[PDB]
Amino acid sequence: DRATWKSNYFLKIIQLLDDYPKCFIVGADNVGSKQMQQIRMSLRGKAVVLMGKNTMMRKAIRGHLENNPALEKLLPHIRGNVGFVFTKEDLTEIRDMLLANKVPAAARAGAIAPCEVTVPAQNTGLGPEKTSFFQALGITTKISRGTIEILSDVQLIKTGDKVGASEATLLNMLNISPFSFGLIIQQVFDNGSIYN
């Protein structure tokens, strides 16, 4: 049950700080479960990424402060959905792999937009049967060669706007979605030292 789950989590965070003296305090903000499964399974030989209740990691580290007092610098740097990357491999190669493994996620029907979604004026591959998904946004379309030609560029979703459920579907069926979410690393712990 949940009590022995917490007590096992204490053990599997005690031994993962007794093993690796080198850590990343990385923000797992709004990444997918499979988009973390890809990175976790890909770096399995070369990293161990860990998450959990931050108010549980506070007391899990304070149960080690009996032994290693250099872990106190981790405590003010656990706020928000932030977790651990444990390794004995590198200092910047797996950093660049964290930077390079981030995947452009699909446009959620209600997520905030970080960047200026627009569509280039082009001939898509949808076909004439699927014009009503452009008519819901008011895109002036033309049928050529059995597909749909978007005549002009459309600024449909701008930076810092709500992504509508109607205007999120045509991004999915045009198979372009600029929302690349990944790991947003901000605090490094390496042998009792912190760098940005």
Partner 1 sequence: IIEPSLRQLAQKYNCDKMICRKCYARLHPRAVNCRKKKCGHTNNLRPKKKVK
Partner 2 sequence: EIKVVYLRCTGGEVGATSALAPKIGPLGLSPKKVGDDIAKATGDWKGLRITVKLTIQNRQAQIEVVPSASALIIKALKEPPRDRKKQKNIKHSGNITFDEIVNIARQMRHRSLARELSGTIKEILGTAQSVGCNVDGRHPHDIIDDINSGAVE
Partner RNA sequence: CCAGAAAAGGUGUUGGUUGAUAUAGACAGCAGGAUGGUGGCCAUGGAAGUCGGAAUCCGCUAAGGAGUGUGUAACAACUCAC
**In the complex with RNA, which residue's Cβ is closer, 3 or 196?**
3
Q: Are strands 147-150 and 82-86 parallel, antiparallel or unpaired?
A: unpaired
Instruction: Check binding of 44 to RNA (CB under 7 A).
Output: yes
- What number of chain residues touch partner 2 (CB under 8 A)? 3
**Binding range to RNA, per CB under 7 A, among 48-56, 72-80, 89-97, 116-124:** 48-56
156 within 8 A of 117, measured Cβ to Cβ: yes
| Residue (of 140, 169, 166) closest to 153 by Cα position | 140
Chosen residue from 6, 8, 11, 41 binding partner 2 by CB under 8 A: 41
Binding site partner of 136, from partner 2, partner 1, RNA, none, Cβ cut-off 5-8 A by kind: partner 1
Residues 151-180 that bind partner 2 (CB under 8 A): none
Q: Report which secondary-structure segment, H or E, holds 11.
A: helix 2-19
The maximal CA–CA distance of the chain, rounded, in angstroms, is: 73
Determine whether 158 is exposed, middle or buried from the number of CB atoms within 10 Å of its CB (0-12, 13-18, 19+): exposed
* Site residues (vs RNA, CB under 7 A): 2-3, 5-7, 9-10, 28-34, 36-37, 40-41, 44, 48-53, 55-56, 58-59, 81, 83, 108-112, 165, 172
